[PDB]
Amino acid sequence: KTVVVTTILESPYVMMKKNHEMLKGNERYEGYCVDLAAEIAKHCGF
């Protein structure tokens, strides 16, 4: 089950990347929580 991570658009936690229109998936977003997500997912394995 590719986990569903919900988050809110609030700088600088989760923001729309510069060229977000030319990107898709998780690459569209950037911020504190965006990085925190990858870290949590790495230690929890998912």
Curated annotation (Swiss-Prot):
Palmitoylated. Depalmitoylated upon L-glutamate stimulation. Induction: Down-regulated in the pyramidal cell layer of CA1 in the hippocampus by global ischemia. Detected in forebrain. Detected in dendrites of neuronal cells. Expressed in the pyramidal cell layers of CA1 and CA3 and in the granule cell layer of the dentate gyrus. It is found in: Cell membrane; Postsynaptic cell membrane; Postsynaptic density membrane. The M4 transmembrane segment mediates tetramerization and is required for cell surface expression. The postsynaptic actions of L-glutamate are mediated by a variety of receptors that are named according to their selective agonists. This receptor binds AMPA (quisqualate) > L-glutamate > kainate. Homotetramer or heterotetramer of pore-forming glutamate receptor subunits. Tetramers may be formed by the dimerization of dimers. May interact with MPP4. Forms a ternary complex with GRIP1 and CSPG4. Interacts with ATAD1 in an ATP-dependent manner. ATAD1-catalyzed ATP hydrolysis disrupts binding to ATAD1 and to GRIP1 and leads to AMPAR complex disassembly. Interacts with GRIP2. Interacts with GRIP1. Interacts with NSF via its C-terminus. Interacts with CACNG2, PICK1 and GRIP2. Interacts with GRIA1 and SYNDIG1. Part of a complex containing GRIA2, NSF and NAPA and/or NAPB. Belongs to the glutamate-gated ion channel (TC 1.A.10.1) family. GRIA2 subfamily. Ionotropic glutamate receptor that functions as a ligand-gated cation channel, gated by L-glutamate and glutamatergic agonists such as alpha-amino-3-hydroxy-5-methyl-4-isoxazolepropionic acid (AMPA), quisqualic acid, and kainic acid. L-glutamate acts as an excitatory neurotransmitter at many synapses in the central nervous system and plays an important role in fast excitatory synaptic transmission. This is Glutamate receptor 2. The lineage of its organism: Eukaryota, Metazoa, Chordata, Craniata, Vertebrata. The gene is Gria2. The chain holds residues 414 to 459 of 883 of the full protein.
